[PDB]
Write a protein that binds this DNA or RNA. Structure first.
Ligand SMILES: [Mg+2]
Ligand SMILES: [Mg+2]
Ligand SMILES: [Mg+2]
Ligand SMILES: [Mg+2]
Ligand SMILES: [Mg+2]
Ligand SMILES: [Mg+2]
Ligand SMILES: [Mg+2]
Ligand SMILES: [Mg+2]
Ligand SMILES: [Mg+2]
Ligand SMILES: [Mg+2]
Ligand SMILES: [Mg+2]
Ligand SMILES: [Mg+2]
Ligand SMILES: [Mg+2]
Ligand SMILES: [Mg+2]
Ligand SMILES: [Mg+2]
Ligand SMILES: [Mg+2]
Ligand SMILES: [Mg+2]
Ligand SMILES: [Mg+2]
Ligand SMILES: [Mg+2]
Ligand SMILES: [Mg+2]
Ligand SMILES: [Mg+2]
Ligand SMILES: [Mg+2]
Ligand SMILES: [Mg+2]
Ligand SMILES: [Mg+2]
Ligand SMILES: [Mg+2]
Ligand SMILES: [Mg+2]
Ligand SMILES: [Mg+2]
Ligand SMILES: [Mg+2]
Ligand SMILES: [Mg+2]
Ligand SMILES: [Mg+2]
Ligand SMILES: [Mg+2]
Ligand SMILES: [Mg+2]
Ligand SMILES: [Mg+2]
Ligand SMILES: [Mg+2]
Ligand SMILES: [Mg+2]
Ligand SMILES: [Mg+2]
Ligand SMILES: [Mg+2]
Ligand SMILES: [Mg+2]
Ligand SMILES: [Mg+2]
Ligand SMILES: [Mg+2]
Ligand SMILES: [Mg+2]
Ligand SMILES: [Mg+2]
Ligand SMILES: [Mg+2]
Ligand SMILES: [Mg+2]
Ligand SMILES: [Mg+2]
Ligand SMILES: [Mg+2]
Ligand SMILES: [Mg+2]
Ligand SMILES: [Mg+2]
Ligand SMILES: [Mg+2]
Ligand SMILES: [Mg+2]
Ligand SMILES: [Mg+2]
Ligand SMILES: [Mg+2]
Ligand SMILES: [Mg+2]
Ligand SMILES: [Mg+2]
Ligand SMILES: [Mg+2]
Ligand SMILES: [Mg+2]
Ligand SMILES: [Mg+2]
Ligand SMILES: [Mg+2]
Ligand SMILES: [Mg+2]
Ligand SMILES: [Mg+2]
Ligand SMILES: [Mg+2]
Ligand SMILES: [Mg+2]
Ligand SMILES: [Mg+2]
Ligand SMILES: [Mg+2]
Ligand SMILES: [Mg+2]
Ligand SMILES: [Mg+2]
Ligand SMILES: [Mg+2]
Ligand SMILES: [Mg+2]
Ligand SMILES: [Mg+2]
Ligand SMILES: [Mg+2]
Ligand SMILES: [Mg+2]
Ligand SMILES: [Mg+2]
Ligand SMILES: [Mg+2]
Ligand SMILES: [Mg+2]
Ligand SMILES: [Mg+2]
Ligand SMILES: [Mg+2]
Ligand SMILES: [Mg+2]
Ligand SMILES: [Mg+2]
Ligand SMILES: [Mg+2]
Ligand SMILES: [Mg+2]
Ligand SMILES: [Mg+2]
Ligand SMILES: [Mg+2]
Ligand SMILES: [Mg+2]
Ligand SMILES: [Mg+2]
Ligand SMILES: [Mg+2]
Ligand SMILES: [Mg+2]
Ligand SMILES: [Mg+2]
Ligand SMILES: [Mg+2]
Ligand SMILES: [Mg+2]
Ligand SMILES: [Mg+2]
Ligand SMILES: [Mg+2]
Ligand SMILES: [Mg+2]
Lengths: 15, 244
RNA sequence: CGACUCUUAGCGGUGGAUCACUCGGCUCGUGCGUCGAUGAAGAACGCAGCUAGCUGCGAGAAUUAAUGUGAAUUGCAGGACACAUUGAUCAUCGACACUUCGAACGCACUUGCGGCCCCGGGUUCCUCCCGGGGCUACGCCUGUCUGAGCGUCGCU
RNA sequence: CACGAUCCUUCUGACCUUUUGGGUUUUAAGCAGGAGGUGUCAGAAAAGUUACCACAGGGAUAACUGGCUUGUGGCGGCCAAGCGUUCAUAGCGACGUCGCUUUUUGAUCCUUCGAUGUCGGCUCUUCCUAUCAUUGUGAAGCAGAAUUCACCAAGCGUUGGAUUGUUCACCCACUAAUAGGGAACGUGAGCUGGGUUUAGACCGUCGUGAGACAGGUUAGUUUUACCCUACUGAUGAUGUGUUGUUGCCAUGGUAAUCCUGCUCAGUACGAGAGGAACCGCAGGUUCAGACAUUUGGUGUAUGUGCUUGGCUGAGGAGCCAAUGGG
RNA sequence: AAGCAUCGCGAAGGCCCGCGGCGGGUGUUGACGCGAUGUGAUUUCUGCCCAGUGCUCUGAAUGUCAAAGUGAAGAAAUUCAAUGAAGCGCGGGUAAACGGCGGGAGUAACUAUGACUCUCUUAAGGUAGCCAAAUGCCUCGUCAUCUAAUUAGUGACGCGCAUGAAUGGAUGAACGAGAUUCCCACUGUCCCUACCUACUAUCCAGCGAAACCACAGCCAAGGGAACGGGCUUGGCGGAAUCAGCGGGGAAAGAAGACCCUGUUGAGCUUGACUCUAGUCUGGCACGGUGAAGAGACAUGUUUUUUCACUGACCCGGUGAGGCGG
RNA sequence: CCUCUGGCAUGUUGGAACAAUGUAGGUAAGGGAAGUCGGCAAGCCGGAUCCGUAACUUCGGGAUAAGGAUUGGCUCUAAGG
RNA sequence: UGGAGCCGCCGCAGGUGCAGAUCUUGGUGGUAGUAGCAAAUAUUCAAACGAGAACUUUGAAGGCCGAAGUGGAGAAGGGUUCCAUGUGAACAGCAGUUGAACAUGGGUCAGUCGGUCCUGAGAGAUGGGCGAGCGCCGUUCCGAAGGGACGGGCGAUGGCCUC
RNA sequence: GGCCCGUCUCGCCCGCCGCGCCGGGGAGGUGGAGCACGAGCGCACGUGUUAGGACCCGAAAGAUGGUGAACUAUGCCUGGGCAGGGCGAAGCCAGAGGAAACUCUGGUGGAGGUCCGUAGCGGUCCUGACGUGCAAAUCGGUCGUCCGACCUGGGUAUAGGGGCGAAAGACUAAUCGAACCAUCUAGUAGCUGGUUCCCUCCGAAGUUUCCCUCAGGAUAGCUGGCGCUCUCGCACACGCAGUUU
RNA sequence: ACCCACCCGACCCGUCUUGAAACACGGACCAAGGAGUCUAACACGUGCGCGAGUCGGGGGCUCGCACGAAAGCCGCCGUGG
RNA sequence: UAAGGCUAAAUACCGGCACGAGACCGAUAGUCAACAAGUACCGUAAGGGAAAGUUGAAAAGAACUUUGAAGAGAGAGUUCA
RNA sequence: CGCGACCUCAGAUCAGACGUGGCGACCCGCUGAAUUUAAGCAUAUUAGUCAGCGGAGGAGAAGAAACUAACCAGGAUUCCCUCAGUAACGGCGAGUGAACAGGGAAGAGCCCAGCGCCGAAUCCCCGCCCCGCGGCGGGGCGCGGGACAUGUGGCGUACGGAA
C-alpha cells in the first residue's frame, strides 16, 4: 500500500 | 552476547597468517654424521628478504654426502654474512661468525642465535632481528649448558643442541618511528589481519567485557585471573604488578 | 414537459450467485504385500506425416514380438490390407529391446582426459590414424597366484 | 492484641501396627501430641537495566485542549483606625469583610491511548475591555504647564532594533501611545524547526555495572487535497410569452486616521520660572481607492549597437553556446 | 592512527578455536616475536592514596577444606575418629589496575582578607595546572571589552552545585563539507515589493489510475460522554457546475513509539536465584624395574621419601644413512 | 563551449492559450543583514603576468595570506636553433 | 422465465439460519472522464505507401550527442531477443501503415579465437584417526603410498621367424 | 432410644489341644463418607463442570532440522584503472665569501598517506526538487577526496548466539539489539474484536469472605429450571409477614 | 403492496461502557463462505427395560453380508464391572 | 538356572498394487489439485504454490445477400430453443 | 646362504560370490527438545513425544522362565477384555501410573558350546560321465586341490544325558 511515513517519523509524536 | 574479537582469531579463517610470498621456513641444517662428527662446508649463494620477517635469510647450499646432489637451506642471516662466503657447520666447526656449532663446544660468553631449544629441532630460540643468546656455563657431566635468552631468562639446555655464532641481522629496526598509519598498514598486510585495533572500551557491551557505559570507562578492574574463561580474559592477564 | 436528481417497474447490460448435474475427492473395509550393480527411485534429453502441453515410449523411441480378440483408427491426410487371412483395432504381456545422468563404477564433470585386449578401414602388426567391440568403482568373503618380515623353527 | 496450613524435619508416647514366604534382631514406615515458618502473616524459593526495544490491551490511568472548582494568581467592592502640614474618603487606606475573573498555577480525571501532530516565532482575520493614546466629559491636594482619579466609549491606533529557541525579561530609539487579553494556551495537508523529545557522540554528578540525570553540549527524513463544506472569484439557474434597454433598490458590506509647523502668543494664568487653548492657514503619518504624464524598476519587441569561442572557403550576411555575454 | 604505557608467554608455553582426535589458528612463527589492554602526533608535564574491590607473590609455620584411602566400635547396614588438595582465611606487592583525593574555630595598631595558630578527622584529604570551559545549581555570576542597545562573543577573577592529570592535565603550528562570535566586502535576507523567461497548472483530442467512503455535508446558542452535520430553540434554504483555497470535516496514513496494566516478552548488566562449557586442584585406573634408606604401628604390616632404570606413554629429527659395543 | 567522422529524433503524446499558485532560471532605484535560531539562499571573489605579502610556527609552513596593478585589436622590434 | 427433477406428514441425524469479526474469496460503485501522461534545448516543408498519417519511409531544411559519445566493439547476464516476409485482434499508459508484439520461415562453419592443459588463494578423496550415526577431521600427516624405465638375460609367439 | 468400626475412660467376669505379654466379652463417653426390611444396574436424551485445537480469529516469544556472503562486512589469489596545474624535500653543479669551520647567491633535481582539479570513488548544505515518485532512498546545483589506510571485476575463505566489523549494535540478498525456510504449531493469552431465525414466561449483579488478589477466579448472595409435601370455596383453614397495636 | 402529498413523530447501526447520535472504535456496496463442535470423565434431572440384582463387553456360534460390516443366539449370562 | 542361539500363529499397517462400500463433500465444498497441477507463477536457495468443471439430443457451430479497411452489424438460415 | 616348514602380513582388472541407493503406513536400535500445564517458575509436566541419525520385513520385535506366586498353587511370546485411573510416583501440587491373578484370540516348540565317545567318520572348490536344468541339484568316478586337530561331522543339552 501507499508509503505515507518513514519508520522513524511515526507521525503523531507526543512524547 | 557476542563471541569477542580475540575468541575469533582461534578459528583462523580471516585471522590466519598471510604466507604466499614467504620464502620458506628459516631452519638449521638437519643433523647427520658429518655435522655430528666433523663439519660440513656450504656456501652462501644469496641473502634474501622474507615478507613478514625483520631478519634477512641466507640461501646456503651444501653437498648432500650420499647422493650427488646439491642440497640447500634457509639460514637466518648472522649479521656480517655475505655472499660467496663459506659457512662451516658441525662439531668440529671453527668458532667464527655464521658458523653453526653445538653450544657445548663453544666457550662461555659466546654470542649465538637460531639456537636449538631441543637437540635436532632445527633452530628455535633467538631468531628475530637484533637478537641473540649468550652461552653462560657448561656442566660437562649431564651434558648440559646454561644459556641467557634475550627475554632475560636463563634457560638450561642440552650441550648437543646447535646454534649459529653471531647475532641476527637487521638489528635496530624498531628505532625508526613508523609515523604514517599507512606505514603500519603496510607492515601487517605482509603478515596477518591484526592491525587497526579497536579498544574494547569503544565497543558495545555485547562484544567486549569493557563495553557499554555513558562514558568510555572500563567499569571493572582491567587486571584479571588466568583461571578465566575465554571471553573475559581481557586487559591485563594474571598481572603480577600493573603500574609504571 | 424542459436538464439534472430521487423512487418504482419493463427491457437491455455488467457480474457469475442460485439450482440441477459430477469420469474428482473424503472416510471405512477387504485381499495381496512386489524396488536396486542383471543398474532402483529420481532427473535429463530425445522420439508423431502434420503434435506445443498432458500422457505413452527409448535411436527397434505415440512403440517390436508373442497370445487373446475379430474390423477398425479416425481432427485431416494418407494408406494399407483381400477382415474365407497370424488378421485391422484394442486388451494382455511370457520373448526382444531399453539414449544420457543418477547408489552410479577407468578418472574427471569441461561433457574434458584416458589406459589395456580383439576386430574393420588404415596397415599388409608399421606403428601411427580413424571407426567398432570388450574390459578398467570402493568395500568385503571363499579360494588362487606373486611375494614381505634381525616373527618361530628345520635341514644344510 | 501479642500469632502461623499441606509437605519435610525433630522430640515425646504405647510390652501399639507394618517392614510383605516365615521367624529373631537392627533400620525404616505408620498412629497420636508438642517444637523448627512462611510478617506479601489462608503460607512462590527470586536483582537490575533498556533512549536499541517488542507484543496484548487500557481513556479502568498520566503527559494537551475542553469541562467542573478557584485554593493560588489577577481584578473589584464594603467598613474606616490612619496617611495626606490642617482634614477619615482630592489621592490613599490598616485591623476586618463581601465579590467577580478564568489571559496564573493548582485540585480533579468526565472525553480522547485501531494516535485530536507535542514550544516558540513568522503570516492573517476577528472578537473582548479589565481604556495606554485619540473624541466628549465630571475630579483634584486642577493658577498655567504637567496631572493623576472617574464616566460614555473598543471608532481608530499601539512601532524599529541589541541579547535570548524562548514565552517572559531587559536595554536602546522613535512615538500620540509604545494598554491588556481571547479565538483547541487561534493558526505544522500555512511555513519554519532554534528548542523540547528516539537512534550517533562529549562532559560533569550518580551507579560495581548495563545504565540514569525538568544537569550542560553538538549531529539528526516535518508526507497527502483531485472529495464535502467554508471562503474567494467564474459560468449559470427558476420566474417575467421571447428577446434587448435603460433603470429602481430589498438586503449584505463599508473607512478614514492621528500628528507636526505657523498664527493666536511669550498672550491668558503666574511673584517669577515658565506657559496654554478655540477659529484660521500650511503640510505630513498610518490606512484606503486608483493611475503611469513624469522619475525609477523590468525588458526575449530577442529592437539596435558592441564583443568572446566556434561554424557557413573569405567578404558581406548570419547562426550556435537551454536567454553566449554585455 | 603514529606516538606513549602497561600486562602474559622460553613452546608439554602464552592467547584462542573445536563435538571429538598423537585435532586445529597465531605459526613458512621464538621476545626487535606472538598474544591482552589502556592512552592517543609533537611540546611540556603525569602530584598524593594499596584503607575498599581487583590482580598477583609465599606456604607445613597453619584455621577450615571433598571423594577415596586409613583406623574404630558394631551381627551388619554403620557410626565415630584420626588424616587433609586446590580454594577460602592468614601475610607481602601492585594505581599508565578499577577507582578515590575533607570539615570546623580564632588570628595583622581603620576595616577587610587572612600569612599564622588551634583543634576533629580519614587510605590520602585535589598537587601542578585549568575555568562560569562541550564541565558552574545559584546564573542573565562580577569586572573589563565588543555594540545606540548584547541572557551572546572575547579577556580577566575563582571555597570549582559537581574541574584536574595516560579514568590523562596544560598546550598547540598545519589541517577540518566539525561547534561558536565579530569585522571588511558583497548581495532582493530585509525595508517592499516589482517585471521578465522556460516547464507546469489552464482549455481541447486521445488515453486514464488511487487513497478515502456508517449515512451525509450552511450556522448561533442549548443541553448532551462536560468543543454537534444530524437532537432542541432560533437564524434560514434555489438546479448543474469551473478555477482556486487550505478554516472546518476533532480529514487521510498506522490496533500510540510516551504513560499505565499484563503474573506477555526479548537485548544488555551484575553482589539476583538456579545451573553450566572451560579451568585449577585431589582420588582411583592404564602404571612397570632396581636401589637405597626413612618414619608410623607392631614385637610382620602399612605409609612410603628420594635417587636412578626402560619397556608403556609422550615429544622432536630424518628419504628413519653410519648407533652401542 | 562550438565543429567533422558516426549516431539520434528530445526520452510513454499532440494542439490552443499565457491566469493564480508553483519548479528552474534571471534583473532590480536608494539602503546594505535593519531579515532570520543562525548571512540559510544568492552575491562578491575567481584565470594569467607583474609586484607585494602579517601574526603565529613543530622553521617545514601560514601563502593564491592580505593588498595592489595590468590584460583587447592592430603594425613592428629584439631575443632565443 | 427456466428445462429435470422435487415435495407433504411421522421418526432419526447434523459441517442447520449472519450485518458487523481493520472477517475470507469473488464482484461493483462514488471518488472521475478527475489526478495525471512536465527531467535531459527541436522541430518544419514536400512526396510515397496506404481505408486511414502529428508519429512509418524517402528527400530537403533546421537542431542535438560532440570521440570521458546518443559513435564503433566485447565481458557478465539474457536466450532467439538476430534476419526476412506477412498481420494489424491484444501488448508497446496518444496514435501507428510501426516494434524487441504476433504468425510463418531462415540464421552461429576454426589444428592457428577461446574452452580444453597448468597451477593460485583454496577445495578435496585414500591411509590414519575420531565418530551413537548420516558422517566429520585431516591432506602429509600413526602408510609395504612407484606397475614406470633403461640396459642385460631367458622364454613365447607374429611376421620374406631374415630382421 | 439401639447396633457396627475407630478411639478413650472405668471396671468386672468368661473360654481352652496349646493357661499366655493367649483369646473373648461389660458399662460410660466420643471420631466414622455406617446399619435401623434393599435400589441398584444398563440404555437413551438434557443442562452444567472439566481435560483435550475445545466458540472463532489474534501475539511478542520458545524449540528442531535445514538454505543463503548474487547485496553488504572483513581476509586471501589473479587481473584492470587513476587529465592538467601548484608548492619545490634530499642529492648535484657553478659563482662569491671565508685563514678554517663552513656560509651565502643563482641553477638543477623532483620528494610527499603534499595543495588545486578532471575521470573515478564518495555524499556536506540547500533541511532545494520529488514525496499515490523516474526511484520501496532517486534528481539538481553545491560539496569531500582524487598516488594511497586509493578505486575496482572475477576467483576464494568465514554462517546464525554464528560470521564479519577503522565499532555505527554496523552489515549478513529491500529482513538484524539475533537472517531466512519448513516443522514442533491450530504454540499460550486473567486481554481487543465477532458470535447467524420467531413468539412466549421469569428475570439479575457490581456487595461477601479467600486468593502474588486489585482488567481474573473462589465462595456466599441475588436468577431461572425441575419438582415434590401439604393446604382449601367442594358452608365447615392453619401457619407466615421490610406493617401497626 | 408501487409512486406522490401533507400533519405529527423520528439523530446510525454494531459494540465496550456508570454514560454513545457522539469530536469513542468497526462498517463504500453486493454475493457466497463464516464461530459453542466432537471424544472422554463426572454430577444432577428426565424417559425406558429389568430389579437384589443388573450389565455387555470382549469372545464365540449362525453366511457368499445385496440390504449386514447389520440382525439373532450363547452352562460363555457372567471371568469381570 | 543367568552371562550362546533358532521358531510359525492370533498382532500392527494415513506408504504400494488391486477391489468393495458410504445417513460424507458436491466446484469459495471435497485432497493443494473434478481441468495440460505440484502445472503456471515467485524466490539465489531451502522452499512457497494458485486460479480454472457445464453450447446442444446431434455441430445441425450460422451457406448465401448486403454495409464497412476491419472488428462489428442488418437480413437469411440451423435448432423445440 | 641357500633351500624348506609354518606365523603374521601385503599386492593382483587373479576365479567366483556378496554389500552400496531407494521407499518408509506399520516395525527394531539410538538420539531427543521447546511451545505447553502448574493460573508466576526452576523439580515436575509437555515426553522418551516432534525434529535428528541408523536398520528391516511382509510384517517386525518378542519368545520357550536365572517367571509368577505364597495357592489345594500356576507354567514361553504376542493380542483383547479386565485388573485400574488401582498399588505406586509427585514443589505428595499440577499431574503421572504399571504388574499378577481371572476370562478369552492363538497355540509349537527347539538347537549349540561344554562334558564324553566314535581312524575327521566332516566341509568347500576343481575335473570327467549319466540324468535334471528360467528357484545350479542328484548319482557315479578321479592319488585333483584346499579347509580342519588352535577341533569339522554323528550321538547329546538340564523336560536330564551317555554307556
Ligand atoms: Mg558506540
Ligand atoms: Mg558481557
Ligand atoms: Mg431501471
Ligand atoms: Mg467461479
Ligand atoms: Mg527371607
Ligand atoms: Mg542511550
Ligand atoms: Mg530514559
Ligand atoms: Mg547505542
Ligand atoms: Mg477518563
Ligand atoms: Mg492625621
Ligand atoms: Mg485541566
Ligand atoms: Mg486535525
Ligand atoms: Mg468601561
Ligand atoms: Mg495552539
Ligand atoms: Mg491547520
Ligand atoms: Mg506539516
Ligand atoms: Mg534541532
Ligand atoms: Mg540523542
Ligand atoms: Mg485540475
Ligand atoms: Mg564578416
Ligand atoms: Mg551542451
Ligand atoms: Mg591503563
Ligand atoms: Mg589492595
Ligand atoms: Mg565511577
Ligand atoms: Mg587547585
Ligand atoms: Mg550579534
Ligand atoms: Mg570566558
Ligand atoms: Mg577526577
Ligand atoms: Mg595519577
Ligand atoms: Mg572524570
Ligand atoms: Mg460529525
Ligand atoms: Mg482542512
Ligand atoms: Mg489524523
Ligand atoms: Mg492500542
Ligand atoms: Mg502495538
Ligand atoms: Mg495480577
Ligand atoms: Mg525473559
Ligand atoms: Mg550470585
Ligand atoms: Mg524537450
Ligand atoms: Mg515528441
Ligand atoms: Mg524512453
Ligand atoms: Mg537592490
Ligand atoms: Mg527582528
Ligand atoms: Mg538581527
Ligand atoms: Mg551559503
Ligand atoms: Mg590566515
Ligand atoms: Mg438436460
Ligand atoms: Mg454433513
Ligand atoms: Mg454478508
Ligand atoms: Mg487533465
Ligand atoms: Mg553494433
Ligand atoms: Mg528485428
Ligand atoms: Mg496504446
Ligand atoms: Mg455441576
Ligand atoms: Mg469446550
Ligand atoms: Mg496463533
Ligand atoms: Mg522461554
Ligand atoms: Mg528536502
Ligand atoms: Mg505532490
Ligand atoms: Mg519520464
Ligand atoms: Mg531473538
Ligand atoms: Mg482457536
Ligand atoms: Mg485480568
Ligand atoms: Mg419463575
Ligand atoms: Mg474491558
Ligand atoms: Mg469510561
Ligand atoms: Mg450505539
Ligand atoms: Mg462530543
Ligand atoms: Mg478498541
Ligand atoms: Mg472505517
Ligand atoms: Mg451465508
Ligand atoms: Mg439418572
Ligand atoms: Mg530372536
Ligand atoms: Mg471451479
Ligand atoms: Mg466454481
Ligand atoms: Mg477446491
Ligand atoms: Mg456453481
Ligand atoms: Mg457457467
Ligand atoms: Mg455454473
Ligand atoms: Mg430454453
Ligand atoms: Mg537401504
Ligand atoms: Mg506456566
Ligand atoms: Mg496463564
Ligand atoms: Mg512466564
Ligand atoms: Mg516423562
Ligand atoms: Mg520421528
Ligand atoms: Mg522375527
Ligand atoms: Mg532364555
Ligand atoms: Mg504371564
Ligand atoms: Mg473401578
Ligand atoms: Mg511419564
Ligand atoms: Mg563337540
Amino acid at each position: 500500500g501507499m508509503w505515507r511515513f518513514y519508520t522513524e517519523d511515526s507521525p503523531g509524536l507526543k512524547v | 552476547g557476542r563471541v569477542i574479537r580475540g575468541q575469533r582469531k582461534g578459528a583462523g579463517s580471516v585471522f590466519r597468517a598471510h604466507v604466499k610470498h614467504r620464502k620458506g621456513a628459516a631452519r638449521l641444517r638437519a643433523v647427520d654424521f658429518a655435522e655430528r662428527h666433523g663439519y660440513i662446508k656450504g656456501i652462501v649463494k644469496d641473502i634474501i628478504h622474507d615478507p613478514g620477517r625483520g631478519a634477512p635469510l641466507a640461501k646456503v647450499v651444501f653437498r648432500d654426502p650420499y647422493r650427488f646432489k646439491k642440497r640447500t637451506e634457509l639460514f637466518i642471516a648472522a649479521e656480517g654474512i655475505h655472499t660467496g662466503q663459506f659457512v662451516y657447520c658441525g662439531k668440529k666447526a671453527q668458532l667464527n661468525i655464521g658458523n653453526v656449532l653445538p653450544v657445548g663446544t663453544m666457550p662461555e660468553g659466546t654470542i649465538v642465535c637460531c639456537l636449538e631449544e631441543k637437540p635436532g629441532d632445527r633452530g628455535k630460540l633467538a631468531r628475530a632481528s637484533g637478537n641473540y643468546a649468550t652461552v653462560i656455563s657448561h656442566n660437562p657431566e649431564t651434558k648440559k649448558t646454561r644459556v641467557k635468552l634475550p627475554s632475560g631468562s636463563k634457560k638450561v639446555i642440552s650441550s648437543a643442541n646447535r646454534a649459529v655464532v653471531g647475532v641476527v641481522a637487521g638489528g635496530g629496526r624498531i628505532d625508526k618511528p613508523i609515523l604514517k598509519a599507512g606505514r603500519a598498514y603496510h607492515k601487517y598486510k605482509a603478515k596477518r589481519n591484526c592491525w587497526p585495533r579497536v579498544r574494547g572500551v569503544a565497543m558495545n557491551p555485547v562484544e567486549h567485557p569493557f563495553g557499554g557505559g555513558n562514558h568510555q570507562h572500563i567499569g571493572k578492574p582491567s587486571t584479571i585471573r588466568r583461571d578465566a574463561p575465554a571471553g573475559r580474559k581481557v586487559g591485563l592477564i594474571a598481572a603480577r604488578r600493573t603500574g609504571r
